[PDB]
């Protein structure tokens, strides 16, 4: 599922602004 | 009318924008409680102002680190804009000052925490719940954009939930007052509009693209473009493709196709009718814009209130000292702060 793919991803925590 | 309200708001803003408040408190007036958050910008600390007993969120930036990160102009923008704005859905800047080492912005504290934590934990918000929050961002961008301000970092991490369940936008680290186009590559990967990724001159339409990303993430529980690395996210954004969960209403999908629109001559918020294309959309038919502004609408969620200084809604961070050198650092760079 898309949800399972998101939860297994490395970007579920707080996201930093770019540099 | 909306034109009349915004005209008075501009007159108020310009007086403060042209003559900014400076040096309105000192570090010794606050008791350090706990770190609320950290990032490349520095940290945000929960503090208590002894003379009032009020709690505040003190954003602390290290001047030397700001210089290394090439964020001098951006930090001056953040403070100059925050001290000048006034809107129900914007976090208030209560005081600001600097010392030999650091810059301090003392903000209104929201113990309710970031929308981010609630959204991740609950998983997703129903459409009426997501709409309630979306309406506050639409009004906030209508206000900011009328002052020639571009926000540039919309995301659930930057939306605080107050004691009444309403939103307060925080973090003006990339906000800028610009009448023309601008070019800085800044923002958060998942929320970048294609014109930013493609190194084009861009305008306030990037905030409306970011609103599409936010509404999608609130209603789906995950963003429209995600991957393990930013490069893979950028490839998805620029592809011109987007997939919606089957539970999304027809009205919600129609609004999102118009906000997540690569074509600038077609993106809602960027047309002749401006923000009214969004306000008048079918998805917002039940939204009473004035009742939202006046905070008369019952909020769908009220964070558990455990006291004015409680931090249960925030993660824990390693506590570091607040060091103040005996020598002034970067005096010229931050002279106007
Ligand atoms: C820790 C979350 N946070 C807050 C607040 N956290 O609690 N009340 C706040 N206000 N204000 C911020 C400004 N800039 C930043 C990067 C983060 C901020």
Top residue of B41, B70, B189 to mutate, by most chain A CBs within 10 Å, is B189
- The pick from B77, B92, B171 for probing ligand 1's pocket by mutation, whose C-beta has the most ligand atoms within 8 angstroms, reads B171
Strands B42-49 and B30-39, bridge-based pairing: antiparallel
- The pick from B40, B41, B59, B113 for probing ligand 1's pocket by mutation, whose C-beta has the most ligand atoms within 8 angstroms, reads B59
Helix, strand, coil distribution of chain B in percent, nearest 5: 35, 15, 45
Residue B276 C-alpha to ligand 1 middle, in angstroms?
A: 30
Instruction: Tell which atom from ligand 1 comes closest to the C-alpha of B168.
Output: 10
Angstrom distance (rounded) from CA B97 to CA A4:
46
Establish if B116 touches chain A: CB-CB under 8 angstroms: yes
Enumerate residues 6+ apart whose C-beta is below 8 A from A7: none
Is B28 an annotated catalytic residue? no
Domains assigned to chain B = 1-19+114-305 (1.10.510.10), 20-113+306-335 (3.30.200.20)
How many Cα atoms are found within 13 Å in the side-chain-facing hemisphere of B2? 12
Which of B317, B337, B315, B319 has its CA nearest to residue B328?
B337
Top residue of A14, A16, A19 to mutate, by most chain B CBs within 10 Å, is A14
Angstrom distance (rounded) from CA B189 to CA B88:
28
Buried b / exposed e along B197-229 (16+ C-beta atoms within 10 A): beeeebbbbbbbbbbbbbbbbbbbbbbbbbbee
Strands B30-39 and B54-62, bridge-based pairing: unpaired
Angstrom distance (rounded) from CA B20 to CA B33:
29
Q: Which long-range contacts (CB under 8 A, 24 or more apart) does B224-232 make?
A: B224/B256, B224/B260, B225/B190, B226/A6, B226/A9, B226/A11, B226/B190, B227/A9, B227/A11, B228/A9, B228/A10, B228/A11, B230/A18, B230/B189
Strands B93-98 and B102-108, bridge-based pairing: antiparallel
Please answer whether residues A15 and B190 qualify as being in contact, where contact means their C-beta atoms are separated by less than 8 angstroms. Answer: yes
Instruction: Name residues contacting ligand 1 (CB within 6 A).
Output: B 36-37, 39, 41, 44, 57, 59, 91, 107-110, 160, 170-171
How many Cα atoms are found within 13 Å in the side-chain-facing hemisphere of B91? 28
Establish if B156 touches chain A: CB-CB under 8 angstroms: no
Establish if B271 touches chain A: CB-CB under 8 angstroms: no
Pick B226's closest partner by Cβ from A11, A16, A18: A11
Instruction: Give the experimental resolution in Å.
Output: 1.6
Enumerate residues 6+ apart whose C-beta is below 8 A from B123: A3, B221
Establish if B258 touches chain A: CB-CB under 8 angstroms: no
Instruction: Show the DSSP H helices in chain B as ranges.
Output: 2-18, 63-68, 72-84, 115-122, 127-146, 194-197, 205-220, 230-238, 250-259, 276-279, 289-293
Which of B71, B170, B70, B69 has its CA nearest to residue B112?
B170
Enumerate residues 6+ apart whose C-beta is below 8 A from B152: B174, B175, B176, B186, B187, B206, B207, B210
Handedness of CA B244, B246, B248, B250 (dihedral sign): positive
CA of residue B150 relative to chain centroid, distance: 11
DSSP for B95-153, please give it. EEEE-SSEEEEEEE--TT-BHHHHHHHH----HHHHHHHHHHHHHHHHHHHHTTEE---
Quote the tokens at residue B54: 């009020």
Contacts of B114 in chain A (CB under 8 A): 14
Quote the tokens at residue B47: 């503090």
Please answer whether residues B243 and B252 qualify as being in contact, where contact means their C-beta atoms are separated by less than 8 angstroms. Answer: no
Which of B136, B142, B24, B147 has its CA nearest to residue B77?
B147
Distances (CA, A) of B39 to A15, A18, B36, B171, B246: 10, 11, 11, 11, 36
Angstrom distance (rounded) from CA A9 to CA B228:
6
Handedness of CA B185, B180, B212, B291 (dihedral sign): positive
Angstrom distance (rounded) from CA B319 to CA B33:
10
Method: X-ray
Angstrom distance (rounded) from CA B204 to CA B169:
17
């Amino acid at each position: 599922t898309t949800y399972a793919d998101f939860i297994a991803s490395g970007r579920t925590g707080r996201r930093n602004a770019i540099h | 009318s909306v034109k009349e309200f915004l005209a008075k708001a501009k007159e108020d803003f310009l007086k403060k924008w042209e003559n900014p408040a400076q040096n309105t408190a000192h570090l010794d007036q606050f008791e350090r409680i706990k770190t609320l958050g950290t990032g490349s910008y520095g940290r945000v600390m929960l503090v208590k102002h002894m003379e009032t007993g009020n709690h505040y969120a003190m954003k602390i930036l290290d001047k030397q680190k700001v210089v290394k990160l090439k964020q001098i102009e951006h930090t001056l923008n953040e403070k100059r804009i925050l001290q000048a704005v006034n809107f129900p859905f914007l976090v208030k800047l209560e005081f600001s000052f600097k010392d030999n080492s650091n810059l301090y912005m003392v903000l209104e504290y929201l113990p309710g925490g970031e929308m981010f934590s609630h959204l991740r934990r609950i998983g997703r918000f129903s459409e009426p719940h997501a709409r309630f929050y979306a309406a506050q961002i639409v009004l906030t961008f209508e206000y900011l954009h009328s002052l020639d301000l571009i926000y540039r970092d919309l995301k659930p991490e930057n939306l605080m939930i107050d004691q009444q369940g309403y939103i307060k936008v925080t973090d003006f680290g990339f906000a800028k007052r610009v009448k023309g186009r601008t070019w800085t590559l800044c923002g958060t990967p998942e929320y970048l509009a294609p014109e930013i990724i493609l190194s084009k001159g861009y305008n306030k339409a990037v905030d409306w693209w970011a609103l599409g990303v936010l509404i999608y993430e609130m209603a789906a529980g995950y963003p429209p473009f995600f991957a393990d690395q930013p490069i893979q996210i950028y490839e998805k954004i620029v592809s011109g493709k987007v997939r919606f969960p089957s539970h999304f209403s027809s009205d919600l999908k129609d609004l999102l196709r118009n906000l997540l629109q690569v074509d600038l001559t077609k993106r809602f918020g960027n047309l002749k009718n401006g923000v009214n294309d969004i306000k008048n959309h079918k998805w917002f038919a039940t939204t009473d814009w004035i009742a939202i502004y006046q905070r008369k609408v019952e909020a769908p969620f009220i964070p558990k209130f455990k006291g004015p200084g409680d931090t249960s809604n925030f993660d824990d961070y390693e506590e570091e000292e607040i060091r103040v050198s005996i020598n002034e650092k970067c005096g010229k760079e931050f002279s106007e702060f």
